[PDB]
């Protein structure tokens, strides 16, 4: 299987910027590398085949190059529609392999997340489960680290995150982390803390509540 390694995983850029995504293969695929663009909820589109041939209709600002093991895609000058995810594919051998993708997001100014903590509804508690929810709003960059501390004890394995797509209006993201415990485990703990550390916070902000104070 020809392993495809794509770099970078994500890149922040503004319209007008020249972008360069790289794709490397574990073995020579001699110029038979294809580049696809994919937007959220839509199917992939063919941009470049045979490492450098442009597909019919693809804008000239797109170009590829490389051979054997190292290939790169260059977008001479990002346009608003070029922000998408890009994949490289090796059609040299079967099975055809794809790169993990490179998300090209809109460069924005740093934004601190508005953190919020919500305790489980009584209705939910009565039914056996407890979902403590922590929502982080309008932050940037995407790199935000939420940590659950039940009675100042680190939680791991019972929390689930979900990051939105880059907001169309402000280029910010929002995250929601959910700590799920059984009603019984919940009741044997008082302080539920959501420690948020983000690149736009001098110090980790923690939002919490004591079971039963609300």
């Amino acid at each position: 299987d020809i392993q495809m390694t794509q770099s970078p995983s994500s890149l922040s850029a503004s319209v007008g910027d020249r972008v360069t995504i790289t794709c490397r293969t574990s073995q020579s695929i001699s110029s038979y590398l294809n580049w696809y663009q994919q937007k959220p909820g839509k199917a992939p589109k063919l941009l470049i085949y045979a490492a450098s041939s442009l597909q019919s209709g693809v804008p000239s600002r797109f170009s590829g190059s490389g051979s054997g093991t190292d290939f790169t895609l260059t977008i001479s000058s990002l346009q608003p529609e070029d922000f998408a995810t890009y994949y490289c594919q090796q059609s040299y051998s079967a099975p055809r392999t794809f790169g993990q993708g490179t998300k090209v997001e809109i460069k924005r100014t740093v934004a601190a997340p508005s953190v919020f903590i919500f305790p489980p509804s009584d209705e939910q508690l009565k039914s056996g489960t407890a979902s403590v929810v922590c929502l982080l709003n309008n932050f940037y960059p995407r790199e935000a680290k939420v940590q659950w501390k039940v009675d100042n004890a680190l939680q791991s394995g019972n929390s689930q995150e979900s990051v939105t797509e880059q907001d169309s209006k402000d280029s910010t993201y929002s995250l929601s982390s959910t700590l799920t415990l059984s009603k019984a485990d919940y009741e044997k703990h008082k302080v539920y803390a959501c420690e948020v550390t983000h690149q736009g916070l001098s110090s980790p902000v923690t939002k919490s509540f004591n079971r039963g104070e609300c």
Partner: protein
Amino acid sequence: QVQLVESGGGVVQPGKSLRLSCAASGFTFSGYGMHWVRQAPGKGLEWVALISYDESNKYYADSVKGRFTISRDNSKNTLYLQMNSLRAEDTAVYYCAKVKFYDPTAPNDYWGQGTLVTVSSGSASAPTLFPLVSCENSNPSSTVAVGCLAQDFLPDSITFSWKYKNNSDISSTRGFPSVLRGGKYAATSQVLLPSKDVAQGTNEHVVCKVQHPNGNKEKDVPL
């Protein structure tokens, strides 16, 4: 124009089987080879299989070899993918792709919309809504945040909708992707209401609504 339309996707338990169809049109279906490429929820593209225009050559990805089976009906201009022994791992959107020209290395120039194939041991169900109210309310902010927690639903096809007590749409809504909580999915929604005195007053609550194939449900979220 060249149109490819997949169908046959659905919710199914492990061990079970499913059969996808990809109706081609706008091009000489019989003259090209076709491929099936899947994309797991929130992950990359993964090549599943290919079949030559003359049906002679058919290759599959190692993970599906023996379980899936590709075929085509050049007369009906339809490509098929028989999926047997479905495992949870196969949950993904399946796309059928046409190749650009008669060459083994030809790029997939035209892709279909895709069909969601959700393989879970849980049963398809409509979500169980629960209201999310900020502990002691969001007083130190110009916007009180109330939320809605939709859980234990399957497949992952839910659409949140919010309406004020006076039954009109709420603009300030945040929708978050669904997380897989053991076979079933769970998703959250959030509404930011101006705390500046209009935090409540008359509107004792808001209404959270969710769309789902197995049943649309709603709940009242207290302000």
